[PDB]
Symmetry: D3
Subunit: 163 residues, 6 copies
Amino acid sequence: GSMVVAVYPGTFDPLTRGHEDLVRRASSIFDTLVVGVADSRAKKPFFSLEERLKIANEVLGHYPNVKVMGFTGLLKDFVRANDARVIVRGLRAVSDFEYEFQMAGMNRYLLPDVETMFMTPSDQYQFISGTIVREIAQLGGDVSKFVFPSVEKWLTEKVAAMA
Amino acid sequence: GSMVVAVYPGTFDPLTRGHEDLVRRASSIFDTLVVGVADSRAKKPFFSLEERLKIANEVLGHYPNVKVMGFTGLLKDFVRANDARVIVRGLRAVSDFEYEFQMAGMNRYLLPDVETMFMTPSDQYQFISGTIVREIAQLGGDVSKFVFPSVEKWLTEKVAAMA
Amino acid sequence: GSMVVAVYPGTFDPLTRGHEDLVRRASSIFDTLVVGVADSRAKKPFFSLEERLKIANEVLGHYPNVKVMGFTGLLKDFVRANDARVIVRGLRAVSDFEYEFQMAGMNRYLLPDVETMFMTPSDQYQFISGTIVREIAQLGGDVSKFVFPSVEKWLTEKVAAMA
Amino acid sequence: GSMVVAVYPGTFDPLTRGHEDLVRRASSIFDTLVVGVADSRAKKPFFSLEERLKIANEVLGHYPNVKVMGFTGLLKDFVRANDARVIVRGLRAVSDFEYEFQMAGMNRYLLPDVETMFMTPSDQYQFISGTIVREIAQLGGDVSKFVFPSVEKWLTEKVAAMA
Amino acid sequence: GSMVVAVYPGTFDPLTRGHEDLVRRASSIFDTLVVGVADSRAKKPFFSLEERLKIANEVLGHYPNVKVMGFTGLLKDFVRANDARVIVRGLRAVSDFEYEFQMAGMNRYLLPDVETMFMTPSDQYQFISGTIVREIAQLGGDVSKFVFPSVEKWLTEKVAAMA
Amino acid sequence: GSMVVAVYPGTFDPLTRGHEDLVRRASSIFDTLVVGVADSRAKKPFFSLEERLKIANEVLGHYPNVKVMGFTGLLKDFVRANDARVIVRGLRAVSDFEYEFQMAGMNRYLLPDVETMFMTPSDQYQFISGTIVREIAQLGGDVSKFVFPSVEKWLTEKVAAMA
Ligand SMILES: CC(C)(COP(=O)(O)OP(=O)(O)O)[C@@H](O)C(=O)NCCC(=O)NCCS
Ligand SMILES: CC(C)(COP(=O)(O)OP(=O)(O)O)[C@@H](O)C(=O)NCCC(=O)NCCS
Ligand SMILES: CC(C)(COP(=O)(O)OP(=O)(O)O)[C@@H](O)C(=O)NCCC(=O)NCCS
Ligand SMILES: CC(C)(COP(=O)(O)OP(=O)(O)O)[C@@H](O)C(=O)NCCC(=O)NCCS
Ligand SMILES: CC(C)(COP(=O)(O)OP(=O)(O)O)[C@@H](O)C(=O)NCCC(=O)NCCS
Ligand SMILES: CC(C)(COP(=O)(O)OP(=O)(O)O)[C@@H](O)C(=O)NCCC(=O)NCCS
Ligand SMILES: Nc1ncnc2[nH]cnc12
Ligand SMILES: Nc1ncnc2[nH]cnc12
Ligand SMILES: Nc1ncnc2[nH]cnc12
Ligand SMILES: Nc1ncnc2[nH]cnc12
Ligand SMILES: Nc1ncnc2[nH]cnc12
Ligand SMILES: Nc1ncnc2[nH]cnc12
């Protein structure tokens, strides 16, 4: 047929069960799925880029056609670097639709030949917010329903270290 | 790489410039794109299924990896019949999001291993409504900005015949 | 300054307190406000066009710079006929946004030099649905909170006549 | 404490797993939950009112504090008749929000002392559309993931009878 | 009947007329309404928790079945502590729906037997934003249409003190 | 006819092609269009007010009936100062609708006789986000598709100076 590489970009602070489900689904469609972890300095992420990469690799490493890579520059440049024809984003019934469609429209100007394609996670992950996950973890609450056990370990350790 | 077939289903009453742009974009990603024209009896389409197939074939025939086919039954069965792993739908900033996400969620129960993926047409087609196109044509207004010339011809002829 | 005519188009089946408030507000801004009552045959209106014009004239006649006129063709043609530079539409927090933005976008193709401008009625009218008004009236319920007394009279008489 | 009766009104054409989950949840909060099945003549329901009542009673009869009753008039009057202080509606991420908030706002005028309260079904039922359920059943597709077995039986029998 | 306690949680920075209306409505339905004022450290509230509690007590103290209490931990724990079966939230036509449904869905995992129920304030309070209230007060503008006189006094004093 | 002044207020950090299109459209309708650049201290703008005024004047100066003015206080006061009867805002399919309708509703309390009117930019500018423009510029990416060349120059110089 053809070889199609897709990029699934995000801050992934941290990778949730929603993100993992999207990776499972997208990697079943595309020949290679590149999970692009953006530095996202201005968003003031809880975990460092190095930490977010380790967290994501722990969860996703077993998928044979998934690559986890960080990037500090423009998504445009990361997509081109990976010879990607598709940007995959998760879209849920409770997504920030304004944000998603603005990004897709602007990336459409920056990368006219690259398609943004939206996929949907399983029903049970449709309502997970990363911001709320971090809030719960910081207040000492368990987030096991929302993130994998390995990710819980990172949250617990980071919360304890910052105190 | 792999051979991935996608289905782009719709009533296509008639095929608009928005639909055509989605076909152009989707057929650039997938090895084969099957445009599935649903009979949609209960929706009381303006054009018959035979007519909608002719209209769509006139516009889309030149695309070498696009197949236009009608179906009178369940989308589930049409997808399986075409060995398709993806259902492509257009999503625009003004889409019926309730409708799209309900269909995707229910098809998720009917076809757990098939992914609904949403794509976006060019900015200039984001606001075209087929219902409004038919309304304009029936009142004798030109719809050339919204549909291809071949489709305009069908609308004009059908409007004249029904009077 | 300048002379600016705006058109406020609708089916007005019947004119509600929400519509009247929009007319009051729009007529305070524009030199002339033309209330365009569309025949809307395909929508199967409860009141005939002649009736909808009488209903609207009863409520709006006192406004010195408001003209109520029917039309059976394209809005494009009605706007041009009235030398209008603006199409006014009501936008409420519970509007059919898909519908409104599709119409505005398509009218933008049909009438590039005419601006669709959205105005908001008072809080107390933001949730009035004409469809629900007709439903209540047909089941013999009072709609005085939603329409003016003159309009109530028309609803009562039409409901009684159809039985 | 207090005795609070709530009404859960709908067309219920037919009762789905989403509706049943809402009944389970609402009946756990309120002393009595009255499921009000509206005749909804103008909506042209697939099942008659008598049929919709039988369908709902089959599914809901086992709940000791749930009453299933039909009504042919105004919801206002049905609520007052049942001494209800609350109207419960399901709200899902894919609800017709325009419709729900218009109804709540208008019922607020009709019944100022009655509160419309929105509840959410389980994630797995958030995307079920009754319209799509009927469409699938009419095309001979199984809807067991969306409705209870007793309801499937009614759909099958009605579809067979209408052919 | 039964004794049902509901919690109405929020940052309440400060309590607005919208919040007060929701308390009035909710306390008419539930046997006890607990207004839970979250510390919300990360949100960087304008008023301290102690101040927000005083502000809310001044407005709400007269309601005989309303309790105002602060909390520094998880909502889950506060709900359980108060033996509450319901979390009440205000939902307006201009609510952050993404945020509300994410919280409800995640609390559904944390507290499966507790129902999030959404209520609607009066039309006249549907468009009040606390963020905009604080912005106006900080720029020396009157917010009496949006908050009670006692709350205005707190805003004025805090604005003057911070300068 | 009449002399109608409208205010188009914003932070304009910086003025984008979307804003410019709205100014072009609004200034064709109103006798005078005042572009009000709010200090917006709390939003922590990238450009100072003086800079944002220079940026906007460079782009908009050629429009004979457009005035660009800064303000540090309440919009209410700026509107009254300019004898304005209309506040114009851009509304796009991807707007923050919550934010826009809250502002309009609250300004409706502050300025009952002033109408907020929403206008729509051309399709090609509907998806431009100022936040994303700043993000791209800070990462050294070209934003020429989103802002005028003069504005690009300001972004480049400010980015270089802050490093
Ligand atoms: C990181 C990304 C993809 C946004 O992702 P996000 O919404 O934080 O992902 P999340 O982890 O929430 O799923 C976006 O900000 C991005 O692409 N950043 C890189 C810089 C860039 O190219 N910006 C222009 C985007 S149009
Ligand atoms: C036809 C289709 C795809 C809806 O398409 P549509 O929204 O009319 O497409 P449009 O032409 O408007 O782009 C849908 O109704 C469908 O799949 N119909 C076939 C019967 C079926 O399987 N229904 C269950 C859908 S979950
Ligand atoms: C009638 C109108 C304005 C829609 O109004 P509406 O939403 O029914 O108005 P309502 O009475 O609900 O406020 C629209 O259907 C129209 O313009 N009809 C005339 C024919 C036409 O030109 N159609 C193309 C619209 S892009
Ligand atoms: C039937 C009802 C509740 C709408 O329900 P629905 O959305 O069809 O319910 P569904 O079965 O889809 O869950 C509504 O149309 C109604 O109340 N009808 C009775 C007549 C009436 O009072 N109408 C005024 C409603 S404000
Ligand atoms: C405070 C609350 C309820 C959000 O309220 P809010 O939207 O700030 O309320 P407002 O005052 O705007 O009406 C929420 O952040 C919360 O529950 N915080 C406590 C910590 C917690 O349990 N977080 C998990 C929420 S799923
Ligand atoms: C600046 C403004 C108009 C918001 O604009 P904005 O959304 O930042 O505009 P943008 O540049 O994004 O187009 C608003 O915050 C404002 O009016 N600020 C002045 C102070 C004020 O009066 N606030 C009350 C607003 S109801
Ligand atoms: N729960 C979730 N599922 C998929 N994509 C997401 N992006 C953010 N949250 C998500
Ligand atoms: N204009 C449009 N573009 C893409 N898909 C669509 N589906 C319906 N209208 C569409
Ligand atoms: N209540 C209302 N107010 C203004 N415009 C409307 N259009 C339809 N309903 C309306
Ligand atoms: N799936 C569903 N769940 C709850 N309420 C509903 N109303 C309509 N569909 C529903
Ligand atoms: N105005 C308002 N009314 C009710 N709940 C709210 N939550 C935030 N603002 C609100
Ligand atoms: N692209 C855009 N067009 C018009 N108004 C806007 N406000 C913010 N972004 C805008």
